[PDB]
Every structure is written in structure tokens, then in C-alpha cells.
UniProtKB/Swiss-Prot annotation, chains A, B:
Homology family: Belongs to the MinE family.
Keyword terms: Cell cycle, Cell division
Signal sequence annotation: none
Protein function: Prevents the cell division inhibition by proteins MinC and MinD at internal division sites while permitting inhibition at polar sites. This ensures cell division at the proper site by restricting the formation of a division septum at the midpoint of the long axis of the cell.
Listed name of the protein: Cell division topological specificity factor
Calcium among keywords: no
Molecular functions (GO terms): identical protein binding
Portion of the parent chain present: 16 to 81 of 87
One of the GO BP terms on file: regulation of division septum assembly
Lineage per the UniProt record: Bacteria, Pseudomonadati, Pseudomonadota, Betaproteobacteria, Neisseriales
Amino acid sequence: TVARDRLQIIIAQERAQEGQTPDYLPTLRKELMEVLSKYVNVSLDNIRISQEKQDGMDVLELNITL
Amino acid sequence: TVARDRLQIIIAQERAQEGQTPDYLPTLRKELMEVLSKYVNVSLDNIRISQEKQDGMDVLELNITL
């Protein structure tokens, strides 16, 4: 099923302005943690989230497994 | 600024059950087209969206530029 399937979502902000603040990730965080969870019925324990900034790119990696 | 920055979001469903129907993408579609657009103030003309299924993986690629 879709729930049993693997859902991977990666968000990259390339050349990120440090003078400004991403006002879109906070929403995506809810979108990936809360919203998608209800669709696949997978716990935040079974969901891996890793936000990491390399070079000038901020990468947010989602791995939802079941 | 964050708006001027490049936002790339890729959604992959690996080993996709064809007997079932993704009931999470429809929401993500609104999340990437409508919701994020308001945060970066970028038009759907300046946003590239490509959904393509290869092997058993359905990939949805987002490129928001400005």
C-alpha cells in the first residue's frame, strides 16, 4: 500500500540568504510531520528528518518508512 | 532574499502500490503550487513542476526560481 511504500522528500534552498529567514520551512515541517503522517499512518518515530546546511544549500531530508 | 533563492523539492514514492492511489500528493500539489508560492512570491510560470514515474518510483520535482 501507499502507507507501506517509502516516501522520501528533500527540500533544498540553494544560495540561502543569511540576512533573511526562511518563512516557508516552518510550514513544510508541519506538512511533512503532521499532514503526511495522517495519509500514510506512520509515526514520527518511524519517520526520519534531517536538516543540514552544506555550502550555501540548506537540505531537509525526509524518509517515511513502514 | 529567500524569495530570490532557489527552492527545489523532490518527492519520491519507491515501490509504489499500483492497486492503491496516493492520497497525499494532491495535498502536496497545493502545498508546492499555492502555499510555497505565497512565501516566495513566485508565479506558477516561474515554477517548474514535473511528475514522472520511472521503475517503481514516482518522482515529483519542484524548481522554484526568481
